[PDB]
Symmetry: D3
Subunit: 79 residues, 6 copies
């Protein structure tokens, strides 16, 4: 199921969540950011305009009017 893989994906890859403005910042272990962010893309979050992954960090762009914090809180509750 998708909710279960989202839960396990976040359980295993989300080291921390942070935010500023319209951006939620996801911290992963090394190399984990593209792995996590690709999955987030594919679960189809309406509040998520898009994501970009580097190596251990993902920037999640919140759809207006939702904030980075509120977006990050959503994802944390999926854990």
């Amino acid at each position: 199921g998708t909710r279960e893989k989202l839960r396990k994906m976040l359980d295993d890859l989300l080291v921390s969540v942070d935010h500023s403005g319209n951006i939620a910042v996801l911290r992963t272990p090394p190399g984990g950011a593209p792995f996590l962010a690709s999955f987030i893309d594919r679960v189809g979050m309406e509040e998520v305009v898009g994501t970009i992954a580097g190596d251990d960090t993902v920037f999640v762009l919140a759809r207006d009017p939702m904030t980075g914090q509120e977006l990050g809180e959503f994802l944390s509750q999926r854990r």
Copy 2:
């Protein structure tokens, strides 16, 4: 010519445009984001502070006071 390659680059790589705040979000096919964003860099958009590409997503930072939307609308009109 540069306008023609910008037009064809956007025609072939820009799956969709979105925006939030000062960020225009470009969606590409798989692997296309660095290809597209590098070219955007090199055409020298004054309104563009910079770009970062992941795999299929580019975040374009709009130069103040222009918005992500207005930046995205500019690029769409180049199509």
Copy 3:
């Protein structure tokens, strides 16, 4: 020392600094963005929510209430 490597890292990799909103934009030579941004991560800037590197560009997310500009000015003074 860390301040010295931050100084030399910035001296050799920071082509330019820019900003918009809460994002400081770092420009590097080709391939230099992950090299620079990883180091910035590891020096532990409280004002820095996180960073993402592409190839020659880094987006540094400023911790509220600090701005991208103020964040970029901090880093420039480390040069």
Copy 4:
């Protein structure tokens, strides 16, 4: 294979080889765009591809050589 042909025309700056690897050079940032499409084709002789920024390493399946794999890509 009509789509791969346009993909190579627009992205393949050069093809080289050594041993069992064919190397593709692209314009900047083009490597994962080209290489992911090659994966999608799914050729039996391609063990795998790695994309950097403007270079793709394509591993040829033994006993095919990287020179042979590069010639097929250069053909298309």
Copy 5:
């Protein structure tokens, strides 16, 4: 090696080889996650790893083959 075993179970879609290279295929974006962990293990026979997006090239140390290195990874 208990952590690598879970890492491979969750990320290793397939393993292939040619010459002295073992190729790991992962779900999308999984390659640098898997490959950095492999580096961390630090096996003597692994000369190095490169991660793309969903493919990892693992270079086997002579005289070990990529087939042999892939079998050890497939084992775990």
Copy 6:
């Protein structure tokens, strides 16, 4: 070649090899910084480079070996 020499001093943590590949290890995120500069040099014996995060695969042109290509880079 004076710039490559400083580039290697600051970024080359180690050099290894297997078959026709020289492997460069860098500090974290250093691989595309080093590798793009190597491309820029444009050595005839370098068929191509791929950068991951901290590892660069440099493919040696036959009949040169990756050991030989790594020794030249280690020299500089």
